[PDB]
Symmetry: C2
Subunit: 251 residues, 2 copies
């Protein structure tokens, strides 16, 4: 069979998502469960205090009045009649590189697919212009066909970024680590029309660790970037110092 | 004098936060910057699409019309006059164990207090009754007191869960790894007053990986559980295998 669950964070009507769904429709059964509108910065947020409305669209897609994580979670806990085999999230309007991945709703939807039997993919198109969604879609199509022939470890979550170029201009595929940024920009305080102060979250800081081997570098050099993400947040490297510290607390 | 920034995800009115703030005010200068509403499930979502209104309450707590991550992020990028020395989030009404940390606003607040340099603690009280916030407050007091004299690595973020028991009934402190949960409970479908289907996210699933060494195991045996969390999401251990697989993709 191969049943693919697709979601995104740009909203159910986004171009990135429609192109991905059309292209993957040739590989298996595609279900789309996506937010009804733009949910950037949603990260892995779940809506817990309120219930969500859900609408079946004329085109077959399912639109949810909730977050990207809400979409995938609901989809794999009863909203879909049949359990999907993997999650693919995207194609995002914009890159998800380095520190940005921590806040990304696109990455979060993929992460929610860790419960399934096959790898989950998050896919993002770089730049600000978004001219070649078809390139990202082709990359994903290829990854899935291979995953069928050549299994990856279970609970593999791949963060994929694709240069906004024609497929032929792509310089290769690279396994990368997450780059880093410098400190975030300060908050911006303004005064609203009634004289109440308001504060914007500042922009992310400039790229810091962006050298060879990072996702930033691969993208800046026209390579598809593929980063495998941890599903266990335990800092094992810290155990030695922390455990001895806890031992010293016994009085 | 030690500067502590306190936040939470239960909201600025929560008993857990009030107790924690009263207790730690003895150890240093405390600034409280917390959401004006219950933001359970917020994960590290950030408000990017709009500016945030912030207000000072009569008791000196700062109330933010946004997420727990918004609170800490704004607090450390120009809302406050001085950089805090550490961030303490909680005390949460309910445990944050294993998988929970992906969605927890409380954990995210502490985590935001890390990858901008600062040490940080997330603190959660177990169970569903929350009879002994004072116990979690006392535990945190002792850990911070000790941290001042017997320093942990500067990059440390701790996820702390406290059994809901009188302090005298705690069996100890334990370093732990994140356990795992079984599949989450089914979505709960209802109909709204106007005849439209609505769906509630179901409760977290039962403990799966719950044996010796895990946070669940420590909590089940009445120990305070202490898990250090990592800031690098790159799954390095998977690189070599993934790199090899990407080459076969390119074949």
């Amino acid at each position: 069979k191969l049943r693919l669950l697709l979601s995104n964070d740009d909203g159910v009507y986004a171009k990135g998502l429609a192109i991905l769904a059309k292209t993957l429709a040739d590989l298996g059964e595609v279900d789309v469960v996506a937010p009804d509108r733009n949910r950037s910065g949603a990260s892995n947020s779940l809506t817990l205090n309120a219930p969500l409305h859900i609408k079946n669209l004329e085109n077959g897609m399912i639109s949810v009045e909730g977050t990207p994580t809400d979409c995938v979670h609901l989809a794999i806990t009863g909203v879909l009649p049949e359990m999907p085999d993997m999650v693919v999230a995207g194609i995002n309007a914009g890159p998800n590189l380095g520190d940005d991945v921590w806040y990304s709703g696109t990455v979060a939807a993929a992460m929610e697919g860790r419960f399934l039997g096959l790898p989950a993919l998050a896919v993002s198109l770089g730049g600000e212009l978004f001219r070649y969604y078809e390139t990202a879609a082709k990359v994903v199509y290829q990854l899935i066909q291979r995953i069928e022939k050549d299994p990856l470890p279970p609970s593999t979550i791949l963060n994929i970024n694709v240069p906004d170029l024609p497929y032929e201009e792509l310089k290769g595929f690279e396994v990368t680590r997450l780059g880093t940024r410098h400190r975030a920009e300060p908050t911006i305080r303004q005064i609203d029309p009634r004289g109440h102060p308001i504060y914007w979250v500042g922009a992310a800081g400039p790229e810091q660790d962006s050298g060879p081997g990072t996702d930033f570098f691969a993208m800046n050099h026209h390579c598809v970037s593929i980063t495998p993400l941890r599903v266990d947040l335990t800092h094992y490297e810290a155990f030695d110092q922390l455990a001895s510290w806890v031992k010293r607390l016994e009085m």
